[PDB]
C-alpha cells in the first residue's frame, strides 16, 4: 500500500514531501531544482488556467507567444539568468539567454506596434515556462528553478486605466486562490523595497502557512507606469498630435498556487482537493458481478449529466482497501462505494474527504445531494483556512510585541511609517533577536487594502515617527 | 492600408511573407529562427490544441509537463542541441542542454514508474516548445529554431496495442489537418532512412505546396518499439512473472500546421482562414450615428446565440473599404455589411472570403444561413485543395519519367524496392541533374515523402523504377521542405 505516515503538525517538511510524492503529483529529476509535474498535479493547473484564461479574455486580453530567448543588449537596460553559448560543438555570435520574465522580449515589439492612441489599449498574455536560477536550496512547487506561469502585459493611454486594470487582475488572482483553490489571500500594496524593480506600484495577494508561520506571495500585479516606456521608447499620439508615453502594467501567476493549495488543505492522510479544481470529483469504487459493475456506469452517466467528473475504479487486480487508501491520498473529494448490498438497497454510500462523514443516498437523490456535498466541502475548506489565517495574525502597537508574536508562528499587523530604511533595520534586528533552515528575520509582506482605522494621533511601531498605514509583517519565503 | 501586392502564383516566396506579416500574425525577433506569434495565429493554435487535447483525453492520454533541460550523459545515450553553460558570469558544474525532444527526459522516469502489467498502458502528453538550432535558412512557422508543439509518449505491454495507438494518433492528425485546417494530407510510412532515429517504424501525414511543388511532413507518429526500453531499462513483470520490455510510441505536432494552412488557402488578397478554426467567423462592419451600431450589436448577440464568433469593427476613424481590405488580408471567412439603407429593409449584405459571392439575407434568416455558408466554405476549401493535391501527383514507371514531373512542380508515385542505398542514390542523382538543368537559367534533390497507406495494386514482378529490382511498394517522391 501507499499512504502518508508523516504528521502535518510535527515535521511539516517531510509531510509536504510525502503528500506531494505519494499522491503521484511530482517526480524528481536528475537536474537540481527542477521537478516533473505528473498528470494528477497538472489537471489542476489546467482548471485554474482555463478559468483565468476565460476571465482575461472577457477583459479583452489576447493570448500570444514570444520567444524564450533574449539578446544580451536588450536585457542590459534597467544575475539569476542562464545563458546559452554553444550549438552542438561550435560557439554562437552572441550568448543568448533564457527568459526570467518577458518584459525585455515583448516591449521592443510594443514600441513598434504602438504608434497612435488608436493602437491602445494593447493587452497580451502568454502561458509559458520561466527559468530563475539560484544556488539556494529548492522546494517543490514553491521554489522551483523552472516554473510554469501566465504573464500578461498591458499598455494603456492613461495611468487611470492602467491602475484600474491592475486592480482587476488582482481581483482575478483573488478569485483564483479564494474561489478556485479555496486558499484565502490578502490583497495588499508592496513595500518600496519589496516592489518590482522599475515599476511604480506593485499590488499583491499574500498567503500564510501556519505550520512554520511563514508568509508567501501568492500572485502579483504591477503598475509599471511610464518607467518602462522610457526604457523601451513606447510612445503614441492622441488626436492632437502630441507624443505621449504609454502606461504599462504587468502581472503573473505561477504553479506556486498549487503548492500553497496543498499546504492549506492536506492533512495527516495526504491531499485534500477543493471540488472546483479536482480532476476527479467523485470516484466510484465497485465492491464484489456484472450487475454491480454495470450499475456503476449508469450512475457515472447520470452524474456526468450534472457536469460532475466521475471515474469508475473498475480495476480488478486491486484490493478495494488499496483503492480506498489510493484515492484518500489522492485527495478526491467524494468517494463512492457500491457493493452488492448497496445495489440491492437501491442506495449508495459516499464518504467525504474533508471530514470523513458517511452518507447513504438514494439513486434518485444522488446527483443533487452530491452537488450540495461538493459545494459545502469547498465552502468549509475555505472557511477553516480563513479562520486559521485570521487567528494567525496579531494586531500590535509597539515593537515590544513583535518577537513574542513571531515566536507563536504568527504574523503581525502594525502601524508603520513606511520609511524604506526602517524596513531593513527591522529585518536586521528581527534576525538578530531570533538568533538568541531559513532565516528568522521579519520583513514586510504587504500593506493591506482593507486598512484598519488609523486613530487621530498615531505612532510607528519601530521608529516612533508618525505612522502612515497598517503593514503586515512576518517571517517570509 | 496593409494590402498584399504580391501574386501568389508568381512570387510565392514573397507572397507568403506578405500574407503572414500584413495580417499581424507574426512579428520578427532580433534572434534569427525565432518569431513572435501574435494573437491572430495563436487563437488558431488554441483551437487546434483544444481539439487534439479533447480527442486524446478520450483515449486516456493525460497531460503533464517535464523539465526543459536534459543532462549531458542522459542525452548522449545510444547534435542540433542548445547547451546552457553559464549563470550570469559563473559557469556550471555540469553543462545542461535545452530539449529538442523530451524522450531522454521522460523515459528515465518511465523506467521508475513501470513495474508490473498493471501500470500499463501509460499515455502521457505535453504541450510545450522545443529548440532545434539548425543553422540553415529559417522560415516562419515552417522551419523555426524554437517552435511550439504537443508531444505524446506512450508505453504498452504488447506491440499490437502500441501500433494500434500509433494509427489512432495518426488518424487524429489527419482530422487535425483535414477537418480543422481543411488541408488534405496523405497517410504513409516513412522510409528506412527517413524514419525516426532509433524507432522501429515511423508513420506520417504529408502535405503538398503546389506553388513550389514541395512536400512537407505535417505531423508524425512513431512506433519506437522495444528499442528505447533497452536504453532506459523500462521493463515490467508479465501476468505470469516473466520480466519483459515495454513497447513505446512517440508522436507530435507543431505550429508548422498553421503555416501549411496559410499556403493552402491564402490568395492574392491575403489570408483565407477555414471557419472551424477562425477566431472571427463573421465581422460586422458598419458603413460609416448610433442607429446603425445598435442594430449591429443586436445582430452580434443574436449570432452569438448560435456559437458564431463575431467581432463588430466599430472603429469610426477608418473608411468601410479600408476595413473590408483589413479583414480580407486577415482572411475572415464572412463579412457582414450593414448600411443605413439596409436598416429600413431589414436585411444585411454578407460576402464570403473564398469566392467573393455576395448574398443579401434577412435578419431572421441570418444565423442558419451563415451556419450553412461556413459549412460550405469549409467543404469547398478542402475539396479544392484535395483536387489540387491529386493534380500534382504523377504515377510513373521509369526513372525517365522523374525529371519531367519534377520540372512541372509535381511529385511522383513510383514502384520502389525500398533499399536505402537506392534512396540516397536517387537523391544525389536528382540533385546532380537539377543543377545541370539550372545551369542555363542564371541561378533541388528529390527524396522519399512516404509510402502511402492507400497502396495501388502492385502487378506481379514489377521492377523498381530506379534499380530494376523486384518492386516492393509505391513510394511518394518529391522535393522536400
Ligand atoms: C515556483 C517559483 C515561483 C516564483 N515566482 C516569481 C514570480 C512570482 C509569480 N507570479 C511572484 C512574483 C511571487 C509571486 C512567483 O511565483 C519564484 C520562484 C523562484 O524564485 N525560484 C528560484 C529558486 C530556485 C531554488 F532552487 C531555490 C530558491 C530559493 C529562494 N530562497 N531560498 C532559500 C531558496 C529559488 N519559484
Ligand atoms: C517548426 C519546425 C518543426 C519541426 N518539426 C518537429 C516535429 C515535426 C512536426 N510536426 C516533424 C518532424 C514533421 C513531423 C516538425 O515539423 C522541425 C523544425 C526544424 O527542424 N527547425 C530547425 C531549422 C531552423 C532553421 F532556421 C532552418 C532549418 C532548415 C532545414 N532545412 N533547411 C534548408 C533549413 C531548420 N522546425
Ligand atoms: O515576474 C514578475 O515579477 C513580473 C510579473 C510578470 C512579469 N514580470
Ligand atoms: O521529434 C520527433 O520527431 C518526435 C515527435 C514526438 C517526440 N519525438
Author numbering:
A (entry chain B): 331 to 408, 417 to 626, 632 to 779, 790 to 830
B (entry chain A): 331 to 408, 417 to 626, 632 to 786, 793 to 830
Study text:
The five PPL derivatives were buried in a ligand-induced fit model between the ATP pocket (470–483) and the loop (528–538). In contrast to L35, L95, L96, and L97, compound L36 showed poor enzyme inhibition as indicated by an IC50 value in the μM range compared to the other four compounds analyzed in the current study. This is attributed to preferential binding favoring the (S) enantiomer (L35) and not the (R) enantiomer (L36). The stereoisomeric configuration of cyano- and cyclopropyl groups in L36, in contrast to L35, creates torsion at ~90° in the oxo-pyrrolidine and methyl-pyridine groups. Regardless, the 6-methylpyridine core is stacked between the phenyl ring of Phe485 and the guanidinium moiety of Arg594. Whereas the significant ~90° bent in oxo-pyrrolidine exposes its hydrophobic core to the active site, displacing the oxo-pyrrolidine keto O atom away from Thr592 and surrounding water molecules. While the possibility of off-site targeting by ATP-mimetics cannot be dismissed, genetic selection data shown here provide evidence these compounds target only PRS. These ATP mimetics and their stereoisomers (e.g., L35 and L36), while occupying the same catalytic pocket, exhibit specific and distinct inhibition profiles.
Aminoacyl-tRNA synthetases (aaRSs) are an essential enzyme family for protein translation and, in several cases, have been validated drug targets. In the current study, we examined five ATP-mimetics L95, L96, L97, L35, and L36, based on the 1-(pyridin-4-yl) pyrrolidin-2-one (PPL) scaffold. We successfully co-crystallized all five compounds with TgPRS (L95, L96, L97, L35, and L36) and three with HsPRS (L95, L96, and L97), all in complex with L-pro.
